[PDB]
Amino acid sequence: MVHYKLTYFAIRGAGECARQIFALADQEFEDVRLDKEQFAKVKPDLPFGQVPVLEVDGKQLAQSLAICRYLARQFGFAGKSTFDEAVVDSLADQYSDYRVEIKSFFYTVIGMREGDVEQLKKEVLLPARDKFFGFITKFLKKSPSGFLVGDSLTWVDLLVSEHNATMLTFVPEFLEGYPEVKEHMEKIRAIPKLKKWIETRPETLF
Amino acid sequence: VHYKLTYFAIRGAGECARQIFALADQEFEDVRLDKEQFAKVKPDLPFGQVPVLEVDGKQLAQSLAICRYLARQFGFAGKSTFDEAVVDSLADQYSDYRVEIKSFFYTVIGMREGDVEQLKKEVLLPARDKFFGFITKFLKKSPSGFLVGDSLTWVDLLVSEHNATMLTFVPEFLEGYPEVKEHMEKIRAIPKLKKWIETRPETLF
Ligand SMILES: N[C@@H](CCC(=O)N[C@@H](CS)C(=O)NCC(=O)O)C(=O)O
Ligand SMILES: N[C@@H](CCC(=O)N[C@@H](CS)C(=O)NCC(=O)O)C(=O)O
Structure with missing residues (x-):
């Protein structure tokens, strides 16, 4: 299948919408929640230095609105x-x-x-x-x-x-x-x- | 398809869409308002703001949504x-x-x-x-x-x-x-x- 990895903090905030989309598409995904210190390490490899970042088959996509819209179109x-x-x-x-x-x-x-x-x-x-x-x-x-x-x-x-x-x-x-x-x-x-x-x-x- | 971009007499948020029509060689109505004519149409805009695009009368607000919509079309x-x-x-x-x-x-x-x-x-x-x-x-x-x-x-x-x-x-x-x-x-x-x-x-x- 297509593999999905949502990376975000241990909160709903900007990442939740995407998490609800997968729930409704019955789509299984990896749901990664980071602390401050874990974020600080991955941060420079993120497209704009921030989260949420989605990966579709490894390929990175930032900005919550773009993520949610992308996933909404798929499902x-x-x-x-x-x-x-x-x-x-x-x-x-x-x-x-x-x-x-x-x-x-x-x-x-x-x-x-x-x-x-x-x-x-x-x-x-x-x-x-x-x-x-x-x-x-x-x-x-x-x-x-x-x-x-x-x-x-x-x-x-x-x-x-x-x-x-x-x-x-x-x-x-x-x-x-x-x-x-x-x-x-x-x-x-x-x-x-x-x-x-x-x-x-x-x-x-x- | 008739297009009407309504915005102020400036580039700002409305310009992106204007550049899309230019590149699609798409003719459209380009409405530029002063403060007082805005004040009159404002309550009939979907969120009380501009830019607002109309496709065959159908109103669409929010510059990003407008630009993306027009970009997809062309x-x-x-x-x-x-x-x-x-x-x-x-x-x-x-x-x-x-x-x-x-x-x-x-x-x-x-x-x-x-x-x-x-x-x-x-x-x-x-x-x-x-x-x-x-x-x-x-x-x-x-x-x-x-x-x-x-x-x-x-x-x-x-x-x-x-x-x-x-x-x-x-x-x-x-x-x-x-x-x-x-x-x-x-x-x-x-x-x-x-x-x-x-x-x-x-x-x-
Ligand atoms: N437009 C961005 C804003 C998200 C955002 O600002 N997230 C913060 C968490 S509150 C972040 O990733 N890092 C915070 C920071 O280090 O500035 C989006 O939707 O992803
Ligand atoms: N956030 C909106 C911009 C809406 C907005 O603030 N429009 C301004 C012009 S750049 C405006 O109409 N201001 C006066 C008002 O709200 O009455 C967008 O992303 O298109």
């Missing part, structure tokens, strides 16, 4: 047409811009930077969430299938669903008045093969 | 799915790089308060050194001269245009990277692209 979770795929691509990119806005809150609460959690929540996180959910909700209200794009699962369903499940861990109010976003999160994570992975994967915060 | 995305992915990662790396230098970039075009010189010497140049380190590595291991595979792909157009733009503000930008200089020249010498470079509206970025 049928990218979109059922080239334009639909592009629409999925834009949701993924929007989500990434959203991650930049909340970077300050997100790295404070995992505790790898110091700051005031509470005003970062109120002033940074929640306004960025309101804007972003405003867009997500619009795609959901105009999708009667229940997925963000088209009539089936695509990998942005997995990004947006996992992020929201993760954030409820730190901010229980997070999906406070957005029932359609709540619905989506539940719908996707109820897919038995995904739920299985959720139950069996190593438990990490974020 | 044959500039990569000649396999993995090669396309490798092109995707270069594009994404470049975008991370844009985040690092955001503070310098908006100060020097003068649409932001700033401390030019330490931003240049402490922010811009170290981010460039790291980024060019990667770009150079792809170039040294590419016998064709393009960042990926043996032909033009849309990241060639992003990286080439950004470097030409930055030389405008920082003339020492490419100095200790002749291979990056080469790449910039190689791509922008492609006649169809050079013709667009000579005929497009001149803007200060």
Whole structure:
């Protein structure tokens, strides 16, 4: 078969989306989780000095979005047409811009930077969430299938669903008045093969 | 197929797509808005921002998604799915790089308060050194001269245009990277692209 090796830290973060893709494609792969010191040794042989890095039959591929998209195309979770795929691509990119806005809150609460959690929540996180959910909700209200794009699962369903499940861990109010976003999160994570992975994967915060 | 690129009267995020149409000899509507006309159309855009591309009325936002979509249509995305992915990662790396230098970039075009010189010497140049380190590595291991595979792909157009733009503000930008200089020249010498470079509206970025 094609052999796959996901290399990333001992956390979900940027590597998780790809791990969910393999779970849903029932695709077996090597799932390498590194500590700081192990990373420091392999780092210079990585295409951009960072992780996640995927290997397909030895050949290296960096950047989480590129990884997830590549794997989604192989297994049928990218979109059922080239334009639909592009629409999925834009949701993924929007989500990434959203991650930049909340970077300050997100790295404070995992505790790898110091700051005031509470005003970062109120002033940074929640306004960025309101804007972003405003867009997500619009795609959901105009999708009667229940997925963000088209009539089936695509990998942005997995990004947006996992992020929201993760954030409820730190901010229980997070999906406070957005029932359609709540619905989506539940719908996707109820897919038995995904739920299985959720139950069996190593438990990490974020 | 009718195409409509909507963006501001600048190159910035919209230019990559404009270069794709130039190279595909694809005619399209090229809509450049001022602040006040944007403010009026903004709420009907998918994420409230530009660039937005329309294919036969169907709206598509996010510059990377636009460029990749158009590249696939016209044959500039990569000649396999993995090669396309490798092109995707270069594009994404470049975008991370844009985040690092955001503070310098908006100060020097003068649409932001700033401390030019330490931003240049402490922010811009170290981010460039790291980024060019990667770009150079792809170039040294590419016998064709393009960042990926043996032909033009849309990241060639992003990286080439950004470097030409930055030389405008920082003339020492490419100095200790002749291979990056080469790449910039190689791509922008492609006649169809050079013709667009000579005929497009001149803007200060
Ligand atoms: N755009 C990159 C960002 C990922 C990233 O920054 N990962 C960090 C871990 S938090 C890394 O690999 N190294 C951190 C470092 O050494 O700077 C991606 O999606 O892979
Ligand atoms: N992250 C988006 C860029 C979206 C964006 O910030 N667009 C700018 C122009 S370069 C804009 O429209 N700014 C004004 C606004 O959001 O109202 C992309 O990757 O295309």
